[PDB]
Every structure is written in structure tokens, then in C-alpha cells.
Amino acid sequence: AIERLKRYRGLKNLYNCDWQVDEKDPSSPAEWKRLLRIGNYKNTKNRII
RNA sequence: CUAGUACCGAUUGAAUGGCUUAGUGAGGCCUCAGGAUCUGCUUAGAGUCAGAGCGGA
């Protein structure tokens, strides 16, 4: 069970967990800082136009 | 950060409308004049040959 499943964290509730977004785990894509990240898409869109 | 809501207040920017000072004023109508032209009569041009003179539009 360990070698099959060690990657699984286990949680009480997804809505309450503190899972980090840009997690450093190795299966995360090579591009992260390479990716564009925006936040307020609404306030970006209308501003650009 | 964004949204919403308002005040003044600068340009008169740049316009719309009412009132008002001063000055100007189209057009037709009435009236004082003017007379391009057209035409009747008359002594008189000829057996249309001119001129003048008295009228009308």
C-alpha cells in the first residue's frame, strides 16, 4: 500500500485543506515561472482593450 | 485597484434657448416720379416718300 499510494496526502475536506498551488513536487510541469499568471482576469481584460 | 455618485469650477472650449441695450434691415403692398418700346389723329412727304404737333398703352 505504501509504494502504490505514498503520494496521496489524505485530508478531511478539500474545501478546508491548505493545499499549496505551485507545489514543488516533481510531477509538477517543468514550466511554472515560465507560465504567465494573471489573477484579476476581469480587470486585466478591459484594461488591455 | 475597480465600480457607483456629486460638487463646484477652467476654457465660452462650442454650442442651443428666453429676456434685453445699441445699430442695421430682405420682400411684396400703397404712393411721389421715370418713359426702352407700341399706336390713333392732324395743317403737311408722293400719284411709302418726311417733319411737326395733339392723344392712348
Give me A25's grid cell.
513536487
Q: How many Å apart are A39 CA and B8 C1'?
A: 39
Give me A35's grid cell.
507560465
Q: In this structure, which amino acid lies at residue A14?
A: L
Instruction: From residue A5, give the alpha-carbon distance in Å to each of A9, A25, A36, A41.
Output: 9, 15, 32, 37
Using C1' positions and the CA of A46, the closest nucleotide is B2
Query: Is there contact between A44 and strand B, defined as CB under 7 Å from any strand atom?
Result: no
Give me A45's grid cell.
481584460
Give me A1's grid cell.
500500500
Task: Tell me the C-alpha distance between A21 and A26, whole Å.
Answer: 14
Method: cryo-EM
Give me A48's grid cell.
488591455
